Amino acid sequence: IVGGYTCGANTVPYQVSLNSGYHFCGGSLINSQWVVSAAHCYKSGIQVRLGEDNINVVEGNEQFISASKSIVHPSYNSNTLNNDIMLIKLKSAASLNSRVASISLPTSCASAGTQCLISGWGNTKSSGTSYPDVLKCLKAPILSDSSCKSAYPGQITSNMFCAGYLEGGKDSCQGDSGGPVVCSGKLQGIVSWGSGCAQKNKPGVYTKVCNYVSWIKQTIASN
Template sequence: MFVCPTVCFQVGLFLFPLIVGGYTCARNAVPYQVSLNSGYHFCGGSLISSQWVLSAAHCYKSRIQVQLGKHNLELSESTQQYINSAKVIRHSGFNTYTLNNDIMLIKLATPATLSSAVQTIPLPTSCVAAGTTCLISGWGNTLSSGTNYPDQLQCLKAPVLSAKQCSAAYPGKITNNMMCVGFLEGGKDSCQGDSGGPVVCNGELQGIVSWGYGCAQQGLPGVYTKVCNYVSWIQSTIASN
């Protein structure tokens, strides 16, 4: 059984998602990936416009420093930009226990300067089909049992599972706003510290790292917020803030 390390979030029944079984990303190959920091890295996020970041509601803190253009969290890098949050807006329907509507917007105090290392990722134009291979990234734990938090950004390519496979893995726990991505045989997954980070499929942000039982366990894939259901919420929230 997966044991929750001291830095892992625990809400309701769930232990939250590091990348297990992945590889070190090429430097600045994921230019939309951000680190949410409050004196330490605690979650990931995605830059969706020069002034807005999308993450998971369970990553909420009232004040957040957003670190952009990062590859190695332990080094000072020429590409990095550190920008404080001006507003942190959780979805009003977020449920702490079921993790339904696990989505949050962060407005940056000043717009990010876009560069080869800092880029926005498009929102989905439609929901992603089962079987599509996507890229998951983060600085989360790389061990399915034990802890090893990497300095360098980790990547994992994994398929979107069908709604039927997802519901069968977590009976009664999957809402229409969630999707499973990963491998039912286990061995590869997101894990603690990756929460809030991106799942990108065909160049669009389709998922947000949300929850799972343990990490990389057989029959228990990672569960992700289904971004395609929230495009209008994202657009209206940005427009009114």
């Protein structure tokens, strides 16, 4: 997250860290045994880290749980990043509490201009590399499809939306993929891709979660 602020420990209790040795992606807890992330975050052998704030120091509220299944969307296209969503089942159910809590799935899509909370442990610099110990947060609006398509000609499918600031300075970044975009208490987006970070006219591009709510429900019921 570039241009954000320190969230405060466990203030975003649905935020998880995906870990294959080190933190590489975020994700969102949607119930005690399931996590939503990006399909491009797929790895075998992921360990999910819930209740994190400082990912580099065990502080006492964490739950580390192995992924038993990681299910990429069946229409995921790695070339265009169309359908960039993945469901991760936890080997054992998490213990839900005030620091480890699920986030609701949408019951309608969000509209442009709606303010969202985007979070993660990704790079904080638009020019350079600086990874934070603690969870970073960014409030950003959803952008109009025309703005998104103008920034990224021919690249934006109906399963994507842009969020951020066309003037630059405030964006998600590498290390944030798969993490949440929450709007009015609903998971509307997943960190997916962008051209650079926090660059002018290059806003973040996010998987449109409302297009997948049946898939999520059916995948959960089926596994």
